[PDB]
């Protein structure tokens, strides 16, 4: 039987009622203001009962998933009233997954790697292993939030989004801005201040807007490519508020076009966080209270790159890293990073030896072609060998402690970044400059922790300890940044 859903996680107040088959009956949404929810809901829920008879509805759904504290409990109030005054069951739904489902329900998608980019949050989710798991994730603020915040700084009208896309389309100069990748995650608040200052500096607003996107969406489509492999899906869906963004739609397509994977976007009215959205999932789940940080990865479902060439140089078998150019990204930025990262994979995999930590010998640096000649150490990734040889987790912890002692901070620490011939050579350093800052060191740690939790959840426990076994050994200020690691981890949604 058919079901009504209530949406009130953030700023939009959404009432919506959908059928068990898949047709929306009512779907209207009016835009600290929990009063807005506490006053809009009665109005919209009236207009709903003036479109569908109350008696014939069987289920009350309410987005109890990721969102603000007071905004949620208002929706929970209206939900708990409805359920007993109708004597119909209540169903607490996860807000993020709700976006994915009415994506599938509207688009001809079935099992997509979804980039959920909204003003509220931004992250890459794909159903893997009986749960919906988040891979890519913003470490600070949503692309919407970050973009909107810049608009308000420039004093552009309150749907900032459109006009920044507008002015972007008239830019000519790609301004230099902080591209930031922390393993699989992204940070935006750096890029935000950068654009904020670029504006004060004198650069054309028209320009600042273009590159801002160019940096935002390029680093967005970048992590999505990363997920596209790990999850190996045939389809790339785009839900969320900012899914509107023609340019982001453009490069997102372009990207999926290379790996021949499909690309869907839900028809306009089903990207904005809405009533019908969560209404579908509840009855879909059919076929208990708040949790402001609904860690998506905790649900029960019941609806079941740069290429290497091996070559011999002088008297050594070596490899050569051609940083293949990506067509999806701006021509000026595209080649700009692959030079920039080659200039650090060289500068670091070499400087790394200076404090006794194994990495391939670099025999040639070629920024013109973005290729780098380093000795071919015979591949046996630490990732693949960590089960039986748990002893390997020790030195990986060790050699990271060397780096943190010397202010050298890798930003993409993963078990597939190391191999085994005799020691643990890091066969990658592309991104990771030097930083004195204590918060940096702590951030890099959790980047690897998340990496092990990502691909090695099966035998994670007592091996993040085996990491520390080496990390405690080397770096002395180890309890210093791990205590601060707690401070930056408590960056969850506002309990």
């Amino acid at each position: 039987m058919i079901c009504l859903g209530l949406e009130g996680t953030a700023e939009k107040t959404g009432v919506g009622i959908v059928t068990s088959d898949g047709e929306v009956l009512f779907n209207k949404t009016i835009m600290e203001a929990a009063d807005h929810h506490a006053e809009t809901f009665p109005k919209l829920i009236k207009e709903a009962f003036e479109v569908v008879d109350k008696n014939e509805i069987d289920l009350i759904a309410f987005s109890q998933g990721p969102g603000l504290g007071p905004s949620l409990r208002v929706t929970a109030t209206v939900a708990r009233t409805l359920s007993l005054t109708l004597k119909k069951p209540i169903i607490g739904v996860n807000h993020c997954i709700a976006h994915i489902e009415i994506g599938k329900l509207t688009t001809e998608a079935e099992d997509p790697l979804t980039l959920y980019v909204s003003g509220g949050n931004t992250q890459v989710i794909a159903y893997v292993s009986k749960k919906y798991r988040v891979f890519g994730e913003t470490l600070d603020i949503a692309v919407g939030n970050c973009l909107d915040q810049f608009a308000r700084y420039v004093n552009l009208p309150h749907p900032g989004g459109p006009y920044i896309e507008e002015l972007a389309r008239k830019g000519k100069k790609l301004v230099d801005l902080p591209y930031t990748v922390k393993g699989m995650d992204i940070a935006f608040s750096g890029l935000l201040t950068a654009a904020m200052r670029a504006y004060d500096a004198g650069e054309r607003l028209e320009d600042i807007c273009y590159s801002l996107q160019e940096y935002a969406f390029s680093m967005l489509t970048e992590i999505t490519e990363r997920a596209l492999a790990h999850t190996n899906k045939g389809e790339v869906m785009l839900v969320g508020g900012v899914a509107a963004n023609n340019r982001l739609r453009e490069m997102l397509k372009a990207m999926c076009e290379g790996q021949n994977v499909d690309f869907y976007v839900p028809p306009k009215e089903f990207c904005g966080d809405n009533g019908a959205m969560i209404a579908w999932l509840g009855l879909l789940m059919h076929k208990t209270k708040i949790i402001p940080n609904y860690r998506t990865d905790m649900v029960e479902v019941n609806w079941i790159e740069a290429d290497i060439k091996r070559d011999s140089y002088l008297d050594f078998d070596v490899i050569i890293k051609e940083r293949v150019k990506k067509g999806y990204r701006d021509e000026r930025l595209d080649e700009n990073i692959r030079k920039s990262r080659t200039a650090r994979e060289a500068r670091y995999l070499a400087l790394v030896k200076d404090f006794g930590i194994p990495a391939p010998y670099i025999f040639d640096v070629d920024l013109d072609n973005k290729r780098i000649m380093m000795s071919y150490i015979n591949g046996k990734l630490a990732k693949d060998v960590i089960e039986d040889n748990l002893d390997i987790a020790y030195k990986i912890g060790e050699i990271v402690g060397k780096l943190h002692k010397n202010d050298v901070i890798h930003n993409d620490l993963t078990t597939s970044n190391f191999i085994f011939d005799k020691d643990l050579y890091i066969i990658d350093f592309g991104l990771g400059k030097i930083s004195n800052l204590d918060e940096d060191k702590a951030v890099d740690l959790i980047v690897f922790k998340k990496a092990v939790l990502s691909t090695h959840h099966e035998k994670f426990d007592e091996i993040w300890e085996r990491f520390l076994e080496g990390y405690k050994s080397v770096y002395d200020r180890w309890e210093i940044i791990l205590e601060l690691m707690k401070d930056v981890e408590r960056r969850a949604r506002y309990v």
């Binding site: 002088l314 500068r347 070499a350 030896k353 200076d354 670099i362 640096v365």
Partner: protein
């Protein structure tokens, strides 16, 4: 056809050898890692944006593992004792070999137990040298 690269024991580095048409470079054999070191420097000089205005003087700076030219000569410039002569034609080699002294000795090119303190004292253990030359442009 490779460069005539052979070490020489007993050297007589004088006024002469240079400004008479020496189209063939020679370094100080005490701080040449191996015959590979040179073979690297020549490849590096041969395929990177000319840091020196003649190929033969570039070999000096590449092998030096440093950008500066005057300071490059300070650390790898040929001197009395032993040297690593580089040439093209067998008798163009003979001309310079006649001017300086000593026997052709390839064993002075390679790293003794002695070099691997001094060589990496002034370079800051045998291939690491090549990577200093490799990063010479960052």
């Amino acid at each position: 056809d490779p460069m005539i690269i052979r070490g020489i024991r007993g050297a007589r580095i004088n006024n002469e050898i240079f400004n008479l048409g020496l189209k063939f470079q020679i370094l100080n054999a005490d701080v040449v890692a191996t015959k590979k070191h040179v073979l690297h420097a020549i490849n590096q000089a041969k395929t990177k944006k000319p840091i020196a205005k003649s190929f033969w003087m570039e070999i000096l700076v590449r092998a030096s593992g440093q950008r500066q030219i005057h300071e490059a000569i300070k650390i790898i410039g040929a001197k009395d004792g032993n040297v690593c002569l580089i040439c093209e034609d067998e008798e163009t080699f003979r001309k310079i070999y006649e001017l300086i002294g000593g026997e052709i000795d390839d064993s002075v090119l390679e790293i003794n137990e002695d070099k691997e303190r001094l060589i990496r004292e002034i370079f800051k253990v045998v291939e690491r040298v090549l990577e200093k030359i490799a990063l010479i442009e960052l």
